[PDB]
Amino acid sequence: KCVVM
Amino acid sequence: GKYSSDPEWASIKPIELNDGSDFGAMPLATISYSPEYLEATSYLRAVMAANEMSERALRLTGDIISMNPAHYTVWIYRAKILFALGKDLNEEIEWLNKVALKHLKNYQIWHHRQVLMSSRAHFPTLPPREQDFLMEMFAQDAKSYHVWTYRHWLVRHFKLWDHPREIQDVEALLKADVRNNSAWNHRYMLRFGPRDENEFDAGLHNTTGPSSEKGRLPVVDEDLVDSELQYSQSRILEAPENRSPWSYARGVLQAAGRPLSEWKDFARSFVAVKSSHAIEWLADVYAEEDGSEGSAAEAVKMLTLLKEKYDPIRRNYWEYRIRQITASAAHATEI
Amino acid sequence: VHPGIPALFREPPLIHDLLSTETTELQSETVNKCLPLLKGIHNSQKGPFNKYGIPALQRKDHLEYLYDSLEDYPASFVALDASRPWMVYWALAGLCLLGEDVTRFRERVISTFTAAQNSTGGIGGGHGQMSHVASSYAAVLSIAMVGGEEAFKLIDRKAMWKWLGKLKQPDGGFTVCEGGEEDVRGAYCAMVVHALLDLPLALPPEAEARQNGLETFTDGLPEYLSRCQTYEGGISGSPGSEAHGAYAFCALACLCLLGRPEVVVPRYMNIATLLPWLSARQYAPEGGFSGRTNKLVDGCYSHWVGNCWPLVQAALDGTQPLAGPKRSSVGNLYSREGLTRYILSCCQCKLGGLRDKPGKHPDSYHTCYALTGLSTVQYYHYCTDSSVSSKDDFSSAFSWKHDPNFASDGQGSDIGVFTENDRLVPFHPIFVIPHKSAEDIRVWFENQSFDL
Ligand SMILES: CC(C)=CCC/C(C)=C/CC/C(C)=C/CONC(=O)CP(=O)(O)O
Ligand SMILES: [Cl-]
Ligand SMILES: [Cl-]
Ligand SMILES: [Cl-]
Ligand SMILES: [Zn+2]
Numbered sequence: 001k002c003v004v005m
Numbered sequence: 006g007k008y009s010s011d012p013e014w015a016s017i018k019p020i021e022l023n024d025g026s027d028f029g030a031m032p033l034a035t036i037s038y039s040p041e042y043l044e045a046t047s048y049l050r051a052v053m054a055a056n057e058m059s060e061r062a063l064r065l066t067g068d069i070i071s072m073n074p075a076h077y078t079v080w081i082y083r084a085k086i087l088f089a090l091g092k093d094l095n096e097e098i099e100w101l102n103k104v105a106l107k108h109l110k111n112y113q114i115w116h117h118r119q120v121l122m123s124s125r126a127h128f129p130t131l132p133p134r135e136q137d138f139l140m141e142m143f144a145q146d147a148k149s150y151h152v153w154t155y156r157h158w159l160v161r162h163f164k165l166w167d168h169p170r171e172i173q174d175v176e177a178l179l180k181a182d183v184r185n186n187s188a189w190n191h192r193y194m195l196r197f198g199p200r201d202e203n204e205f206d207a208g209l210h211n212t213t214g215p216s217s218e219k220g221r222l223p224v225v226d227e228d229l230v231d232s233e234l235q236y237s238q239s240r241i242l243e244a245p246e247n248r249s250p251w252s253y254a255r256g257v258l259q260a261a262g263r264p265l266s267e268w269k270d271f272a273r274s275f276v277a278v279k280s281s282h283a284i285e286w287l288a289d290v291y292a293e294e295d296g297s298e299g300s301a302a303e304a305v306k307m308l309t310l311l312k313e314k315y316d317p318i319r320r321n322y323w324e325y326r327i328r329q330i331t332a333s334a335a336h337a338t339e340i
Numbered sequence: 341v342h343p344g345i346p347a348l349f350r351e352p353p354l355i356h357d358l359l360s361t362e363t364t365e366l367q368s369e370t371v372n373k374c375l376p377l378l379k380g381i382h383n384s385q386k387g388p389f390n391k392y393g394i395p396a397l398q399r400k401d402h403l404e405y406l407y408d409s410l411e412d413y414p415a416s417f418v419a420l421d422a423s424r425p426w427m428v429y430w431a432l433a434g435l436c437l438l439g440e441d442v443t444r445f446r447e448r449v450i451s452t453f454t455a456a457q458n459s460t461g462g463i464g465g466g467h468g469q470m471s472h473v474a475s476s477y478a479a480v481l482s483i484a485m486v487g488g489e490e491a492f493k494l495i496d497r498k499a500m501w502k503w504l505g506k507l508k509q510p511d512g513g514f515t516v517c518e519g520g521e522e523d524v525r526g527a528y529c530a531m532v533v534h535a536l537l538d539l540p541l542a543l544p545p546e547a548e549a550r551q552n553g554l555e556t557f558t559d560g561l562p563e564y565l566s567r568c569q570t571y572e573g574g575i576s577g578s579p580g581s582e583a584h585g586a587y588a589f590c591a592l593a594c595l596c597l598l599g600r601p602e603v604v605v606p607r608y609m610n611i612a613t614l615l616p617w618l619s620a621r622q623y624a625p626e627g628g629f630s631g632r633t634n635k636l637v638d639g640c641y642s643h644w645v646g647n648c649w650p651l652v653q654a655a656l657d658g659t660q661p662l663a664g665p666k667r668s669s670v671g672n673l674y675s676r677e678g679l680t681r682y683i684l685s686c687c688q689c690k691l692g693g694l695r696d697k698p699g700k701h702p703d704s705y706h707t708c709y710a711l712t713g714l715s716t717v718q719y720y721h722y723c724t725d726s727s728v729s730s731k732d733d734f735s736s737a738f739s740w741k742h743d744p745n746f747a748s749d750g751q752g753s754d755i756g757v758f759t760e761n762d763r764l765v766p767f768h769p770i771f772v773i774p775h776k777s778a779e780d781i782r783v784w785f786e787n788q789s790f791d792l
Contacts, residue, residue: 026451032412033427035411035413076470078464133476183359206579216610244357315354
């Protein structure tokens with residue numbers, strides 16, 4: 001799982 | 006609906022969602038929000054528009070966070086309310102710890118922690134179980150980037166570079182997994198990171214200098230450097246293909262103004278090859294610090310081993326290094 | 341197994357330490373999931389398989405996935421509320437890469453972002469959310485891709501400038517929103533919005549950062565980014581954090597908005613340590629990039645790490661003159677073959693969409709950035725002495741041009757193992773949209789007087 005903000 | 010039926014909320018009218026649908030063409034990537042979330046957020050719009058600092062607004066922010074902890078606006082408004090009302094931030098941290106334990110990879114929870122903990126009026130010194138809470142997080146994900154970022158801030162804020170739990174917690178994480186690069190990175194900050202409170206924070210010393218000298222310490226504690234290099238060698242011997250301690254040692258030598266050739270014999274001991282990092286170390290020693298006698302050819306041989314056998318996906322970078330060494334050697338032969 | 345697949349992509353690495361830790365367990369699991377897909381023998385894979393043993397890009401499947409991703413989501417997707425502008429951007433960018441004309445989305449983009457714009461300036465995740473530089477970046481890039489005067493007109497440029505000026509910090513960086521965190525995303529997203537909207541370089545006269553002696557949006561900024569390099573050579577999100585490919589992209593792309601790559605990047609970064617750390621992001625046999633040392637490959641780094649390469653390569657090659665004779669290039673310093681294998685063999689989902697890695701469901705973020713990285717390998721991207729900007733500030737950023745790097749035949753260290761049938765539209769390495777879209781919005785704004 002990738003999160004950018 | 007919970008807010009609209011509560012007389013606690015009677016004195017304020019919610020602001021309905023306007024997402025642009027039935028004010029034109031239909032909007033994109035819409036979410037069919039639950040009734041509870043639609044209602045809560047419509048009350049949040051109203052309180053924020055009024056700049057309301059109140060206990061009810063504080064409870065509303067906690068409710069919205071329970072539904073969507075990635076709502077960045079509600080966390081910032083929560084922190085405004087906590088400070089405006091003089092709330093007990095020890096109690097806020099105990100609530101935040103529960104949220105943090107429920108949700109991973111989240112910018113807001115760890116930014117909010119830094120907002121609260123930065124208040125010296127409330128937290129004049131490191132709280133007594135703060136390091137243990139960070140270790141609760143690292144037991145679940147030892148490489149959690151936002152928790153390590155918070156711990157770097159905590160070390161600078163409370164001046165913890167020489168605090169024994171910082172090194173002990175890094176060593177416990179490296180005993181559990183010597184390949185934990187996040188722990189190696191924090192080790193570099195504790196040992197070699199800049200500490201001058203009158204300068205902006207940096208990952209490396211000497212960022213006002215030429216970029217080739219970035220990292221150079223103004224004053225070198227030679228015994229500390231020796232100790233950290235010995236520690237690095239001991240960890241390498243447990244798992245010689247682990248990049249992290251090799252990179253850490255390069256960083257220590259750069260900080261100290263010492264050459265890679267200090268480890269020439271150690272690197273040769275792995276070369277029948279037990280470490281690709283040892284081969285790259287040797288290529289650099291022969292290329293960059295040896296001005297002799299076939300040293301250029303030996304560097305090229307090491308890079309050829311990397312490109313053909315031991316790290317072939319990086320062939321184009323090894324060949325770029327071969328071209329640089331060959332040009333340099335040609336320049337040497339020329340003069 | 342197909343004869344066109346080299347052993348490097350069919351076997352684990354030669355050297356293997358005896359000690360098992362969680363890092364090696366996860367690395368080994370990832371290699372073992374990727375191997376049947378790299379070899380082209382997994383029953384989830386659709387052909388045709390090319391001469392290098394690699395499946396086609398499943399264009400129709402991905403188009404349908406990206407169009408569907410623009411429609412409505414159920415309540416369970418509430419955590420994406422703050423990310424709605426991103427979901428618009430990722431889908432439009434994937435559709436553009438795949439060769440769609442996204443003009444027909446102009447009205448729906450206008451509808452979506454009109455509601456998310458705050459009257460005090462900037463764009464947030466949606467009605468009632470405070471402005472955030474990431475949602476403003478996503479919205480501006482979306483507006484650029486759909487184009488048209490009506491979309492460009494929606495943005496309140498003066499209020500955007502006032503709000504972005506509030507984010508400028510004493511140390512030269514930017515927070516991502518008022519009261520939010522400071523990291524290199526803030527800097528890169530703020531400066532891309534600033535550049536594409538041709539905002540004034542000077543800070544608003546009331547900007548707090550003026551009290552700390554700063555005068556313009558770029559004052560103290562490359563120095564701040566230099567302070568995010570780490571001992572490993574890579575670049576972290578904020579000073580002292582761990583080097584990471586996503587933050588290296590933000591920092592290097594932001595440096596290239598400040599001047600020519602061969603001036604700014606070697607001045608503020610130690611290239612001697614940056615280059616090997618960037619090279620070390622790529623693994624075999626997977627072929628893709630990881631974000632940080634001792635972690636796993638992931639298809640979204642095909643953009644964050646992959647698009648660092650044209651920036652670093654330009655810093656080493658220098659600006660290409662349109663008049664002068666062709667100069668020598670350092671070429672590609674990573675394996676285009678490896679990256680292409682990882683994206684096409686390992687990151688395509690049989691039902692459409694692309695993913696982080698085998699075993700993960702797709703999403704439109706991974707679909708956008710795996711496609712973006714596949715496009716990068718298909719072009720020479722370089723900066724020139726010919727800019728579409730009429731002004732000096734960001735002149736180099738508007739000078740980037742592209743030539744196709746055509747599909748190859750034969751073995752080699754720097755080869756194109758996609759087919760030409762897999763060719764995507766080129767994207768600008770700093771703005772992450774088609775060059776013409778970035779050009780058109782910048783030039784339109786350059787020709788508008790700044791609002792009173
Ligand atoms: C323009 C934007 C918004 C750039 C930022 C994009 C990325 C992907 C931010 C990365 C931040 C990151 C280090 C988050 C922490 O969690 N993510 C991981 O741990 C993933 P990995 O294991 O690949 O590091
Ligand atoms: Cl200062
Ligand atoms: Cl707001
Ligand atoms: Cl699949
Ligand atoms: Zn990812």
